Design a protein around this ligand. Structure first.
Ligand code: COH
Ligand code: COH
Ligand SMILES: */O=C(/[C])[N][C]1[C](O[C]2[C]([C][O])O[C](*)[C]([N]C([C])=O)[C]2[O])O[C]([C][O])[C](O[C]2O[C]([C][O])[C]([O])[C]([O])[C]2[O])[C]1[O]
Ligand SMILES: *[C@@H]1O[C@H](CO)[C@@H](O[C@@H]2O[C@H](CO)[C@@H](O)[C@H](O)[C@H]2NC(C)=O)[C@H](O)[C@H]1NC(C)=O
Ligand SMILES: *[C@@H]1O[C@H](CO)[C@@H](O[C@@H]2O[C@H](CO)[C@@H](O)[C@H](O)[C@H]2NC(C)=O)[C@H](O)[C@H]1NC(C)=O
Ligand code: BOG
Ligand code: NAG
Ligand code: NAG
Ligand code: NAG
Ligand code: 60A
Ligand code: 60A
Lengths: 551, 551
């Protein structure tokens, strides 16, 4: 078998076979040397001694509220700290990207072919004696058994951070522009060839689809008016393909950028909000530029919405998730004197870690109704019936489920959770502890350490035998959460670098794009730099209801 | 008409219309302010004071040969200066890219759509009152008159820098992997979606084509043996489509990565040399790695050949063109502590400036034969008749034509030269002086200043009337050359940033790729770092004839 099966190279050293039974570690620029890249250089020694752990930094960022209140109001300091946040997270991501599901070594194919998700760790080689390389049993435990024993919800566990359904559906809507797995090809393939925040879930992945969605007057997107309210146009009207069961009535077959967004009225809520926002920004730009044509209105509005999206994701969405007292800032200028690559390739593991199934409630509570999954799925009539204002008011008040801490996956989506496990295995993912090392975390030394409790840990112990072959995805959902938090350490330490890299990597953050003229002048630039989840709702939903990502 | 038609914003300020008759300039980070971005900040004043002209720096780099001999032998010093060369040129190229033929403003469409060449300057708006904006006559002069008066060769003018046919065919072969105009869409579109040095002209642009060219044993490319010599395989054998006239026999339809390389036996010469090189590197890698399969052998060989190509282009090809006594260095590590974007998008103007028609001789002289263009075109029998060794010996000794200085386009390709002019106009290129300003050069203030002589200048004056509406492409070919040089200032000052960006922007130059393990270990890595045009020929051409890019 492949001599690198055991993953012998540490500290980001790269493993290469040098014969049938021999390997060589390439320790270049790792800060370590020796056979397995485990002997630290002197400066590396010092650095390691001084480095606080991720849990320590998390403690600091979530305490001393008085101090952060001062820091937050000293722009120089706020900028200083945010600069540090951006730069330290980014170093963990290979950019230009490297591996993918078919290439455990760098290749022009893996670099150039955008149909692949990229990989933060190379796959376990096909001929390794065990699924995780050399450790563990010949087969991993039955995925249904892992699912039933430690993932399925017994009783709803609410998020102690107060995340609500506005949050849950924003997470789903936002991330499905770049997690678009191409199941015709396989789980390691994506249909999202822009690999980031291009808002294809609003505008369409292809030019053909975009043009069917556009009005070609005033830069705007097509729409329909039902009971005096603006909604996306129909499939019949646009000839845009959408996934809908055959029985859905014509006028409820809403057509939007992302073909799966008819699946859940919570997605169509945001689809409708962002469609209205696009047209609103068209109106503003036309006021500023009576001389502009439809094409420039459309394109400039799209760039503005991309900026608004990134703004909201950082200052509302990530802000909420982080639990930090420090106020995060979206400010491309902070990187202009830093080394940083304005590009991004979506990693398969980023997709996997974002399978936040436990967020989903047992029922969807709108106004005085409590809809089951069966009632809610593919049912845009609920959106029409209640209207956006009531959707916002209701989802803002409904709490979502805790993601870490175990046993909180709703049985309604059990097949999705099992598939997350099965697909990780098909894609030959390395173990939890290999991923922890890859992101500079200490490997767990026991199952009890992983979960922080005894019952689930004993079940995992009997299932997996060795903590070093525990899998990434189930581990994320059973991990001991941070104190009163929605996530554990692994989720945050992998998720944050992928996220900040996907946001800041966008060309609109680069110096030649980040200027008022890109956005039609100071008026457009201001729309981006003042964007918030509250103003998005206030501008586009009748009655300007209060909203936020916490109950 | 568009109020930015006059190109009012200077110093890279960005022009935006603000009503039908008004514009505003965005002076962000230009170092200037004021209505047209012409008022310098104080720092800017200081910089412009201590900034030597490109002609001054050229003088320094092409004199004091004894001093440069010292410098070239002090690795620290050589590195410092090469680092400066790389970084100063870099800043002139927008990366991530901005405009294209259809977008004179930034847009997601121009950013994301790889089928376009990008644009260093936006196109002149469709409704401008003159072709160059507002200056000049309502129509540009007849392109036939420009061609006949100042571009067509009377007597052959040899390159005083001594460039030979090995050089001219290397230029064509190398650049045609990323200048691949998609004529069914238009001159502003490319089929080269890799936008750089990906060696698609050897391996094919698509996976389907690559797989048809590959042997699938030992990592190798398919080949044929004729009279004991290795050549590319046939169209019949591979089912690879190639462009050939109907009268070419089956056995002479060589199939290579780039569909057009059957056009010219000098291109097939290099195609054969590089195919041999790939298979040679496969043999070396297999010796190092008896455990590797075909796929990894093939992929790793490709990365090595990409590295070899960049190495040769910098240290032999650009070295020769430059005329510098300073010894240029291919060393990705020079950029690792610098701000630099590892990506590239091919500019239309980079394609246009590379239409080095005047390089071509009146006849192609191999052994004791002198082939006409009609005899030479599409005639791979010439290659088989003389063999590669004789091709190399002959083309190494045949001098090429001077590109700048005027009246040196061979009549055989007059239609190609006229097309360069016409297609620049179709793509609505701004004027020579706009491009000069765009690349920090002083606008020419007369036709005489442009040409350095009186006769062609007075022709051009009669044709164009105003030096500020002189066109870029014909100006490159008539420009006053540097002393005894192949090119004038404009060609170099535009071509060098585009070139160094296209070379260093490659992912193999990034720190996660530039490691021996990427290239199968220290032996594979050393192939890149010791590559040269001479070694490429020595290893792959019977007899190891001497070669270089000068006669
Ligand atoms: C982030 C939060 C989130 C939420 C709230 C959510 C809510 C819901 C929901 C009802 C509200 C339903 C019925 C589903 C059901 C599904 N989800 Co999610 N999903 C979420 C994150 C994801 C991600 C990430 C993917 C994978 C994307 C890909 O590759 O297509 C996904 C994929 C799926 C798939 C495709 C299965 C596959 O193998 O790719 C189904 C089915 N789902 N999910
Ligand atoms: C750099 C030197 C160079 C040389 C030596 C050279 C040598 C020769 C040669 C005989 C040896 C012949 C018969 C031609 C003839 C042609 N050249 Co060149 N070409 C060169 C650089 C280019 C470039 C660059 C293009 C545009 C490429 C595109 O968009 O495909 C080009 C395009 C062409 C075209 C198509 C026109 C177009 O609009 O693309 C023809 C025909 N030609 N050339
Ligand atoms: O789509 C999949 C999973 N496989 C395709 C393959 O797809 C390529 C993927 C995976 O290799 O990588 C990225 C490539 N994208 C680009 C832009 O290069 C994809 O093309 O493409 C192969 C070749 O096109 C397909 O294999 C073909 O081979 C046979 C011909 O000998 C056919 O009979 C096959 O059915 C198929 O057409 C492969 O299916
Ligand atoms: C490099 O890593 C290998 C593991 O892949 C080390 O070999 C192991 O060493 C431990 C402790 O010394 C033993 O318990 C194992 O039995 C060894 N396994 C194998 C497969 O050899 C090796 O010692 C490391 N090299 C260095 C210099 O530390
Ligand atoms: C890149 O842009 C080109 C030019 O707009 C696109 O080509 C057009 O595609 C539409 C359908 O989407 C066709 O109807 C036109 O015939 C095409 N025009 C030309 C000039 O070729 C191309 O689709 C775009 N590429 C992507 C990936 O969107
Ligand atoms: C919705 C949960 C259905 C579980 C069906 C499979 C039961 C196997 O799971 C068992 O469930 C018990 C009850 O929570 C636990 O006490 C055990 O630790 C667990 O192993
Ligand atoms: C869809 O929602 C409506 C309420 O708008 C509800 O009455 C209906 O039963 C739902 N449909 C299904 C199939 O559950
Ligand atoms: C700016 O340039 C325009 C040319 O369009 C010129 O008319 C005007 O005087 C300039 N303004 C200043 C302040 O120099
Ligand atoms: C092709 O080249 C051969 C020499 O190899 C020459 O004899 C022949 O005439 C050429 N063909 C044409 C059409 O000129
Ligand atoms: C999962 C990740 C957590 O970030 C929180 C701290 O940055 O954010 C969402 O993408
Ligand atoms: C035209 C340009 C000149 O380069 C010389 C660098 O000093 O090179 C093209 O690759």
């Amino acid at each position: 078998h492949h001599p690198c099966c055991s993953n012998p190279c540490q500290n980001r050293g790269e493993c290469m076979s040098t014969g049938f039974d021999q390997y060589k570690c390439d320790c270049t620029r790792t800060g370590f040397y020796g056979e397995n890249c485990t002997t630290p250089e002197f400066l590396t020694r010092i650095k390691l001694l001084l480095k606080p752990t991720p849990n320590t930094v998390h403690y600091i960022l979530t305490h001393f509220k008085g101090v952060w209140n001062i820091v937050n109001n000293i722009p120089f300091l706020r900028s200083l700290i945010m600069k540090y946040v951006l730069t330290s997270r980014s170093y963990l991501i290979d950019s230009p990207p490297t591996y993918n599901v078919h290439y455990g070594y760098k290749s022009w194919e893996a670099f150039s072919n955008l149909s692949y998700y990229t990989r933060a760790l190379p796959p376990v080689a096909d001929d390794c004696p065990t699924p995780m390389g050399v450790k563990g049993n010949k087969e991993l435990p039955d995925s249904k058994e892992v699912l039933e024993k430690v993932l399925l919800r017994r009783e709803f566990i609410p998020d102690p951070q107060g995340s609500n359904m506005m949050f849950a559906f924003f997470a789903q809507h936002f991330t499905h522009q770049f997690f678009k797995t191409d199941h015709k090809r396989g789980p390691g393939f994506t249909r999202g060839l822009g690999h980031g925040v291009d808002l294809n879930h609003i505008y369409g992945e292809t030019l053909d689809r975009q043009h069917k969605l556009r009005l070609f007057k005033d830069g705007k997107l097509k729409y329909q008016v039902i009971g005096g309210e603006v909604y996306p146009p129909t499939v019949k009207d646009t000839q845009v393909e959408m996934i809908y069961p055959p029985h859905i009535p014509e006028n409820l077959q809403f057509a939007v950028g992302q073909e799966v967004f008819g699946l859940v009225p919570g997605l169509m809520m945001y689809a409708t909000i962002w469609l209205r926002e696009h047209n609103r920004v068209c109106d503003i730009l036309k006021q500023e530029h009576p001389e502009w044509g439809d094409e420039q209105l459309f394109q400039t509005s799209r760039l503005i919405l991309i900026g608004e999206t990134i703004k909201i994701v950082i200052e509302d969405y990530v802000q909420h998730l982080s639990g930090y007292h420090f106020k995060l800032k979206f400010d491309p200028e902070l990187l202009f004197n830093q080394q940083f690559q304005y590009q991004n390739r979506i990693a398969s593991e980023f997709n996997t870690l974002y399978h936040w199934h436990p967020l989903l409630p047992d029922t969807f509570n709108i106004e005085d109704q409590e809809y089951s999954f069966k009632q809610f799925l593919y049912n845009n009539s609920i959106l029409l019936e209640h209207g956006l204002t009531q959707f916002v008011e209701s989802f803002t008040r409904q709490i979502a489920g805790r993601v870490a801490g175990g046993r909180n996956v709703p049985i309604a989506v059990q097949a999705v959770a099992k598939a997350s496990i099965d697909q990780s295995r098909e894609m030959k993912y390395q173990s939890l502890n290999e991923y922890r090392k890859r992101f500079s975390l200490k490997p767990y030394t026991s199952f009890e350490e992983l979960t922080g409790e005894k019952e689930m840990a004993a079940e995992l112990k009997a299932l997996y035998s060795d903590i070093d072959v525990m899998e990434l995805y189930p581990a994320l959902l059973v991990e001991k959460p941070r104190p009163d938090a929605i996530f554990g350490e692994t989720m945050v330490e992998l998720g944050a670098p992928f996220t900040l890299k996907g946001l800041m990597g966008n060309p609109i953050c680069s110096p030649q794009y980040w200027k008022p003229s890109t956005f039609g002048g100071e008026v457009g630039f201001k729309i981006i730099n003042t964007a918030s989840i509250q103003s998005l709702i206030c501008n586009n939903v009748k009655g300007c209801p209060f909203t936020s990502f916490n109950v």
